[PDB]
Structures are given as C-alpha cells and as structure tokens.
Symmetry: C2
Subunit: 549 residues, 2 copies
C-alpha cells in the first residue's frame, strides 16, 4: 500500500505531471514523424536522384530531431524534480515515524538494521529518477506506435505483438525470483551492517582483548553470505537479459525476413519496410528498455515494502488511552498498586509490588543487583507499560496523563549516560531549547559541572565528539545531571523542597539519612521504613547491612 502513499505525495504536484505528459506526447509524435526519414530517403530521393530535395528534406528532419531532444530535456528536468521531492517526503515520513516508536522496538532490533532500512530508500530514489520514469512513460505511450504499425502493415504488427507477448511472459515468469533474491541480499546487507556498527562501536574492547582476527573472520563469513546472495541475483539477471536478448534479436531478424518476403510479393516497398523497422524503435524498444530495468524496479519495490513494514508499527502515542485536565503538575503521592511487569515474555521482574512515596520527600530503593529497581524507574517514566496494575500520581492514574507532561516533569539520571555530538550548551539544552544562559549556569553549578566547562577551551561552546569522547566519564555524568536538573522536574530519579527524589542505590552505606527506604526482594517490597526502623526489626535489611558490614 506504499504506492497509495506515493500517489498521495503526487496529489499536490499535479500540474508538473500534466506538463510531463504533454512533453512526452510531443516527443513521441516528433520521433514517430522522424522515423519516416529512411522511407523518404529510399523510396523518393535515392531512387529518383533528387539531390536538392534530398538536402532540404534531410535538413528538415535534422531540425525535427532537435525538438525531441529539447522536449526530452524539459521532461527529464521535471521528472528529476518530482522524484527528488517524493524521495525526501518518503525519508522524512519514515524517520519521523521511527523516532516515536516504543522502547520495545529499539530494545529488540539492532541499530545497523534500522540504519540499513533507512538507507535502502536510495533504491526508491533510483527507481524514481529522471531516466527510469521517462522509460515508463514511453512504454505507456507505445500504444500510438503500435496503432501506427498496425495501420502500416498487419502481418509485421502481429509479429511485433508476438514479441510483446513473449516479453510479458518472460517478465511474469521472472518477477518473483528477482524480488526474492533482492530481499535476501538486502537482509544479508542489513546483517552485515549491524555487525559493522557493533564492531566499530566496541573497537576499544576488541583491541584490549586482541580479538581483531576473530572479528575479521566473522565479518568475512557475513560478507561471504552477502556475495552468495549477490551471485544468485546476478545469475537471475543474466538469465533474464539473455532471454530478452534472444527474443529481441530473433524478432528483429524475423521482422526483416517477413518484410523482405512481403516486398518480394509486392505488398510493401523497401522504404516502407525500413520505415516500419525504424518505428519499431518507438514500439518495441521502450518495452525492452523497461524490461531491462525490472531488477531495479523490483529492488525499489522490496525496499519500499521493508520501509512500510517498519511504518506499520504503532507509536507510543497510538498505544495511549486518554488525556484530561490532570496535566497541571505531578506533585503528589507516587503509589504503585498491584503492579506486575515482565520484559517481553521472560520470567517476571516485579510480582505484585505495592509502595507509596510521600510527596516532596527523598526516598530510596535498594536490593540486589538485577532485582528490578531501574525497572521501577522506567515504569515511572512510561518507557514500558505494566502488565497489570496502576501507578497513581497525586491520585491520578499515570495512563490518563499526557506523555509529554510525564517526560517533562520526571527526570531520570541513569548510569548509561549519553552525550550527543555538539556543543556543551547544545547537549545541556536537549529538548528544552531557547533557555537563557542563566538557568544553564545555575544548573551546572548545582551539578558541580561549572568548573570543568569553564576550564574547557570554549566555555559552554566546546564541541563534544560522538558519545562524549572529548570528556572523562566523571564529567560526563555531571553533564547528564545538569541536563536533567534543567528540566525542573516534580519527580527526580537518581542512580549512584516539594520535589520528590527517588534514589536507586547499590551501595547501602550512602543512604542512611533518607526519609524512607524501600527494600525490593523477589519482585516485591518486603521491607520499608527509615534506616533506624529497618535495622531495628532485624529483617532482610538487617541481614544485608550485617553481610556488607
């Protein structure tokens, strides 16, 4: 159904299509008129030795030809502009849809696969270029040439019709294997691209462990698979080309043979036969040219099908349920209620977890590694939806709150810090642009990131390489903290007056002054309270404290 999207893209650009078709009509008419040059040369001028009329008629036919070139130039310009606009629209639609897909899509798929699927739009651009769509128009317009051929002679027209039927049979036979081979080679290319991206990202680890040769062998195996698919598709293309060449050449020879037979029988003159053979270039040649580009069209079709495969998935907002006047503030009691969650379909991470967080207080969540604390933090951020249960903020279900407010009023500071390629201010102004250079300074000073930025060659304007390679891991975390502080959130979640602070702590010694501490065990909260209370009743918190110390 991607062709429906393309047609919708052609809905505003309509006068360009009409001009293209008028130019095609004029071009085809002039070519058909100029095909009679050999007939007028042999029947009238060579036979009668009319030298002067030869000169004038040849000059006139040379003049006629240039108009075809000018019209082809104009049509090619228009088609190139149309194709460029269509390709830009397709790429924007795909990218803008991908940027809002749920986190399951990004956790399941690989970066290289998505990047390759985006870059596959080059095939669509090639198929909608200025040299592949004019051939389609010529194939459509060959009806006029066929009508004129039928008027000129019925027998040779029927022979050309047999050639056309052979072309159609060949295309129908070969259409499916070609697209299957193209799909296979593009899947192999996607796998190779994923391996390439993964290898380049972790080059430091590969160098540290001396795994260059093993990585080379793995990439060599993937390249071998790619070349096997490439060879299969090349053999298919070679078979198609050989069959079409056989049909074209034998049809040309048979047409010349039957024309000679007709000329001997007196049903046609030699000039008429030559004119028919010339007009064949405006009847059969466009069709064969189209058949030549069948692999390219099929490749573009498969690429468009994959793009549509990504484009069918529902976005984050599509899976939402409602919104209302709850969008004022998230200040209140965060209350997980009978929350159950599982990642994909593995063992559940949280099993009937209930906890209430008082408003404006600094609470902390503890447990063993992998217990499901960052899972709670991501659930509070609506990155994943609980399997069953509710998460109430200020007495309102979090599903009824607009996702924009949830993402703007809750700040999550995880240890997977990401720094985008850009200036320090650009990194700190992510999603919160057009902020004056005073809030940024206040947040940087709060996050203790002011000093190292001021020590940089350009204060708050130093360009940062990809993934923050220009900074140490310590300063990168402070930049992340400052960026999250600029949000001015109602709920702040951190790893290691009226704003609620939730601390996901791994070391139990850091938090002894928290207002309330929650212990998570076996996917549920088993112990809660202050540090003194938790160490008093001699529970699992007491065991954890004694084991560590």
């Amino acid at each position: 159904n991607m062709m429906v999207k393309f047609a919708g893209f052609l809905k505003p650009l309509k006068k360009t299509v009409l001009c293209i078709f008028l130019a095609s009509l004029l071009y085809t008419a002039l070519g058909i008129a100029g095909s009679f040059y050999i007939k007028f040369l042999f029947d009238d001028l060579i036979k009668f030795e009319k030298l002067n009329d030869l000169h004038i008629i040849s000059a006139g036919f040379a003049v006629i030809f240039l108009l075809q070139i000018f019209l082809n130039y104009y049509r090619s310009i228009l088609v190139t502009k149309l194709g460029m606009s269509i390709d830009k629209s397709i790429m924007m639609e795909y990218y803008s849809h991908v940027l809002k897909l749920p986190m399951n899509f990004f956790n399941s798929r690989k970066v290289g696969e998505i990047i390759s699927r985006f870059m596959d739009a080059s095939k669509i651009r090639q198929a909608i270029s200025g040299a592949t769509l004019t051939i389609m128009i010529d194939t459509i317009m060959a009806v006029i040439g066929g009508i004129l051929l039928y008027i000129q002679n019925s027998s040779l027209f029927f022979i050309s019709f047999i050639i056309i039927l052979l072309y159609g049979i060949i295309v129908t036979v070969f259409n499916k294997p070609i697209q299957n081979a193209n799909r296979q080679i593009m899947e192999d290319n996607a796998k190779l691209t994923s391996a390439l991206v993964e290898s380049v990202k972790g080059i430091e680890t590969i160098k540290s462990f001396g795994a260059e040769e093993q990585t080379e062998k793995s990439t060599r195996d993937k390249i071998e698979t790619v070349m096997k698919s490439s060879f299969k598709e090349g053999m298919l293309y070679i078979n198609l080309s050989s069959l079409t060449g056989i049909v074209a050449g034998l049809g040309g020879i048979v047409i010349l043979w039957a024309g000679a037979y007709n000329v001997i029988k007196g049903n046609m003159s030699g000039g008429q036969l030559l004119a028919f053979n010339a007009l064949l270039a405006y009847f059969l040649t466009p069709v064969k040219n189209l058949i030549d580009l069948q692999p390219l069209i099929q490749t573009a079709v498969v690429a468009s099908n994959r793009l549509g495969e990504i484009l069918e998935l529902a976005t984050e907002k599509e899976l939402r349920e409602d919104s209302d006047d709850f969008v004022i503030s998230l200040k209140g009691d965060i209350e997980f209620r009978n929350v159950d969650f599982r990642y994909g379909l593995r063992k559940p991470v949280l099993k009937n977890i209930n906890l209430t967080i008082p408003k404006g207080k600094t609470v902390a969540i503890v447990g063993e590694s992998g217990s499901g604390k960052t899972t709670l933090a991501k659930l509070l951020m609506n990155f994943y939806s609980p399997e069953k249960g509710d998460i109430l903020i200020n007495g309102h279900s979090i599903k009824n709150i607009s996702l924009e407010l949830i993402r703007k009023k809750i700040a999550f500071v995880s240890q997977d810090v990401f720094i985008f390629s850009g200036t320090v201010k650009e990194n700190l102004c992510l999603g919160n642009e057009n902020v004056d250079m005073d809030e940024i300074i206040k947040a940087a000073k709060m996050a203790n990131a002011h000093d190292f930025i001021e020590k940089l060659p350009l204060k708050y304007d130093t360009f940062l390489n990809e993934s923050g390679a220009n900074l140490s891991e310590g300063q990168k975390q402070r930049l992340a903290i400052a960026r999250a502080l600029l949000k001015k959130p109602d709920i702040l979640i951190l790893d290691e007056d009226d704003v609620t602070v939730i601390i996901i702590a791994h070391r139990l010694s850091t938090i002894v002054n928290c207002d309330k501490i929650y212990l998570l065990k076996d996917g549920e909260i088993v112990e809660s309270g202050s540090h003194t209370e938790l160490i008093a009743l001699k529970g699992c918190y007491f065991k954890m404290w004694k084991q560590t110390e």
Copy 2:
C-alpha cells in the same frame, strides 16, 4: 594507487580473462557478420526476387545470432564471477585494515562515517558487474569494427571518427564536475548516516527529554542537503545525456544523408549503406554506451579513492619498532619515567609523571575527576604513545615489547562495558576462544557473575541483545570483570600470584587498605605512600579525606 591493487587482485586470475577475451572476439565476429545479412537483404534477395535463398540466408543468420547470444551469455557469467571476486577482496582488505588502525582514528572519526565508507563499496560492485564490464571490452574491441568501416567507405568512416571525437570532447569536460558532484553527495550521505546512527543509539535520552521534534528538524536539515547535492548531480547527468543524445542522433542523420548522397553519385548501393548503418552498432554504440555509463564509473572511482584514503593510514604495529624477546613476564615494577601526554592538541594531561608500582602489590591512584587516571591506564595498555617519556615494566621499555603481549598480559576494566551481540560464553571468550568450560566457570565465580548466569534460562548460552540490553548494568559490569579475569593477566587495572593490581578510585573510603596510594594533582604525582603516611603528612590527600569522611 588503487589501480595497482586492482592489478594485483586480477593477477592470480589469468585464465578467466583469456577466456573472456576469446569469447568477446567470437561475439564481435558474429556481430560483424550480421551486418552482411542486413546488406544481402536489399541487394540480391529483394532486388532479384529470390524466395528460397532468402529463407536459407535468414535461417543461417538466425543461427549466427543464436551462437552470438550464447557466447555473450558465457562471457557475462565469467565477468560476473570475476567482479564478485574483486569486490570481495576489496571489502575484506578495507575491513581488515580498519580494524588495525590506532585509537586516534576512532576517537577523531564517527561511527557513521566509517560504516558509510564501507557501504559505499556497493557502487564499486555496481561498476564491476556482468553488464558493465563487458562494455569496456566491446569499446576496446571496436577497433575491428572501425577497420572494417574504413575498408567499406572512407568518408562515412571519417564522419564516424568525428562523432567519436565529439564523444571524447564531451566526456572530457564533464569528468571533473561529475566527480565533484559524486564526492559531495557521498560526503552528505556520510554526515546523514552519522546523524542517523547517533540518533538511534541515544533514542532513550531523546524520549526522556522529549527531543523528537528537535531531532526531526536536525535530520531534515541534512536530508535537504543530500537532496540538493542529488539534484545538482542529476542536472549534470541530464546535461551530459542531452549532449550525448544530440551528438548521436545528429551523427546518425548525417551518416544517412552522406550515404544517400554517395548512393546517388554511385559510390555505394542501398544495401551497402544499410550494412554500414548496421555495422555502426559495433563502432559507435559501444562508445555511446560507455559514455552513458560515466556516472557509474565516476561514482565507483570516488568510492575507491575514499576507501584508499583510509587504507593509507598507518596501523598500530607500523608505528612501533622492534619485538624483542626475553620479555614474556610483565611482572616487574611498573615505572612511569618522565611521562608527558596530551590528547590531540589540547592542554597537557600528564606533566612529568614519576611513579613506580612495586611488583605483586595492590596500589591505588586517586585525585579529582579529569586528573588523568584513566589516561595513565590507557598509557599502560599502550592505547596511546607517551610523547617525551618512557614507561618501563620490568627493566625494559614498553615500546620494545610485542603489542599482542602488552594487550594480553594487561587487563583493563573501565566504567564503560561493551557486550557484543551473542551468547554469554561467546562474550566471556572474546579474543581467547580456546578455553575450557572449567576456566570460564571459575572466572565467573571469582567475578560473582556465576549466580545470575545460572539463573538465566540457558545458563552460559543465553543470547544477549546488542550492547547487552538483555541484562542489567550491574550484571554487565560483573560480566566484564569475569572477561578480564579470564585473561590471567600480569597487570590488572580496575576503575572503581604476583599479579599487580592498580585501582583507579574516585572515593577514598574504599582503598584505605591498599599498599600504596598515589594522588594525582596537576598532571603529576604529588603525594605517594600508604594511607596512614598520607594522613600523617597532612597533605592534599589529608585535605580530601577531611572534606569527605
């Protein structure tokens, strides 16, 4: 030079090329023979009304054409195999070289740019194809057709020679513009791919800060540049194609005009002129097809130059000298002697470093963040070359030690952990795949990663998603510790049995039991010794201790 590389690649294949050229010679002989059919049709059969010699001649020439198409099929298969081999060799060489470059290359470039340069080899593959490479063969073998055309008629041959000169003049002037347009479009595509990869990697941060629209605009501003470059190259191609079409059509019309004049004057006959026009397909059509293939050849040339730009950079082992023996034990006193270092051209990170680490001792390096601790660790791992300095391990220089030994006997555990897409066992076996399961289990037990691995659905075989998204971050750190422990190194470096353990710590509360503590201030060690000694000296370490606990 990449042509030298192509010649070296083609040197082992001296049997395919000879067969290709012999098949090409036979193909051209049969194609030249067909023009004589087109001659005979209008001189002896039609004129004298021979209705049986016509059938015999037509059948014979159909047989000739069938042999010609079979030979073309065989040659195309051989050419396709040759091109596939060449492309595989090129890509494997490029990837093998890229995996060996120093860390400056990877810290200066971007993940998108390198992979874009890799995927730009598809254009070279398109250039060396089964339908493109035969066209150069036909062009170079058009010498036979030109000789026969000259033998047939001198004046029409001179007209065809003028046509070829016009083709050459046309293709000469568009060379640099087409090359520049292709280079610009490829650079813009590389930038777009870098932006795509960066956006996909950090999708979670974009979602958290609500920067979908900002990223959409940022990528739109790059898609627009790519489209502008594409439109410029499309207009250049349209101009070149229009000029080539003008030359071809006007040359054909002038050939027909001069042939008709010659026939009128009695210098030829109608059949001879038709034969000349037919044989022009083996002197002018190959040249015109080669001219029409210029965008592919130029694009492939630009891609090859882009690959060779990377291929010229020196690897790690090419910047080193000597691989002296007598060094198999990196268990001496690690010594930093007057070590100075700076990243790129910024301010120096280490200035006159002087420290010695006793062998088989657990030492700690501390200081504020950004002081140059991970820099020291990377210098020990020999990721970077210390300018104006010397690092000594036992009594030798780290420069005069095998890089494989250096990166096999020294293990570095950093704050960033990379988990490749694969099973847990395949991740613990990176670089060193030939180990028993007992050693892997022992290493996992020492790193405390055995329990959560056993709790996994398939133990040490569970597939881990890209970047270890299937596990917790706390579970990934223990996995990397086990991976580093499997090396059985002589030096172990940790970012918080005579093995030397170096602990890079940010908190002084966790290293008070270490043998010696190194404090790094202003790029040099100012305080060294034990914790008690450092407290007694009442130095900078004492101030840091008083500030926190």
